[PDB]
Design a protein around this ligand. Structure first.
Ligand SMILES: C[C@H](CC(=O)O)NCC(=O)O
Ligand SMILES: O=C(O)CCC(=O)C(=O)O
Ligand SMILES: [Fe+3]
Length: 296
């Protein structure tokens, strides 16, 4: 340690900026303070990071245990644990996958054991149409009308990647039904309580997203009408295509920034493709000292 400085946004405003962070030299107390900022301010922006892919993984390893993405076409060619979102060819070749995350989601919400912390290190940043949208789903839960809180009490949700699974090069010429069935086998839909208690803060989190949450079911396992999910998406801001809803936060960044966020509390989305500007980002996703929630 000696010079990491965390500047948290005041009051209830989301976010924090972190100056002087060096993952190779930060103390244990520095790391614990950064993690507390992540869980309470939700998004920590590390400033002035000039890191190789290997150094980025090393930074993630200070915060938790990295997990590689289960579909390897997303993986960086040198570092399996880095997920690459890219639409800039390198020597004419596609690296990673283009145009990822164009829907509201929490990362790995369709998997049984999601990690708690996402790290994004932007490489190529659109000049005009840059940033990622976020909604804090604990704050969104707290803002629901009381009767809507009651209606989801006791319920469970089903989450699946089936809508947004991306076709891979080796899928060409396969019948689509075989791919659909392979997705159901490899990544079956996962049931979770509709709300859970955040292990680090005690907040109640509404754990749903328009992109991955495919059904809601009662306290006894019987499917409820998806009109309930639509009303929850509506109330929490996930159906507002203008992105002006009060719950929505647009997180911008500049070169050298590195975003670290709470993947229990937040859902996120890419912006509309209103410009032809490219995006390249590297992502590391880490498990911290607790499961996503205590029922895992
Ligand atoms: C479906 C996405 C990948 C993609 O948007 O192409 N998975 C992100 C994640 O849930 O970690
Ligand atoms: O969830 C996905 O589709 C993968 C990409 C992603 O998580 C993101 O772009 O934020
Ligand atoms: Fe994502």
């Amino acid at each position: 340690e000696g010079r990491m400085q965390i500047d948290e946004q005041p009051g209830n405003a989301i976010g924090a900026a972190v100056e002087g962070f060096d993952h190779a030299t930060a103390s244990d107390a520095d790391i614990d303070a950064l993690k507390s900022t992540i869980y309470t301010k939700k998004i920590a922006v590390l400033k002035g990071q000039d890191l190789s892919p290997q150094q980025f993984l090393a930074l993630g390893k200070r915060l938790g245990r990295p997990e590689a993405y289960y579909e390897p076409m997303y993986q960086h060619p040198e570092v399996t644990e880095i997920f690459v979102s890219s639409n800039v060819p390198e020597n004419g070749k596609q690296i990673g996958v283009p145009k990822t995350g164009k829907f509201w989601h929490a990362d790995y919400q369709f998997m049984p054991d999601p990690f708690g912390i996402t790290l994004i290190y932007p490489q190529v940043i659109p000049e005009k149409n840059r940033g990622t949208y976020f909604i804090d789903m604990g704050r969104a839960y707290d803002r629901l009308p009381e009767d809507l809180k009651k209606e989801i009490s006791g319920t469970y949700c089903r989450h699946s990647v089936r809508k947004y699974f991306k076709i891979r090069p080796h899928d060409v010429y396969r019948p689509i039904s075989e791919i659909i069935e392979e997705v159901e086998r490899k990544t079956p839909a996962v049931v979770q309580p509709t709300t859970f208690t955040h292990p680090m803060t005690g907040e109640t989190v509404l754990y749903i997203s328009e992109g991955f949450t495919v059904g809601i079911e009662d306290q006894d396992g019987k499917p409820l009408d998806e009109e309930l999910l639509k009303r929850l998406f509506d109330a929490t801001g996930q159906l507002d295509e203008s992105f002006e809803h009060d719950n929505i936060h647009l997180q911008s960044f500049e070169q050298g920034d590195l975003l670290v966020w709470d993947n229990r509390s937040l859902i996120h989305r890419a912006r509309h493709t209103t410009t032809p500007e490219p995006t390249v980002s590297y992502r590391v996703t880490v498990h911290d000292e607790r499961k996503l929630h205590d029922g895992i």
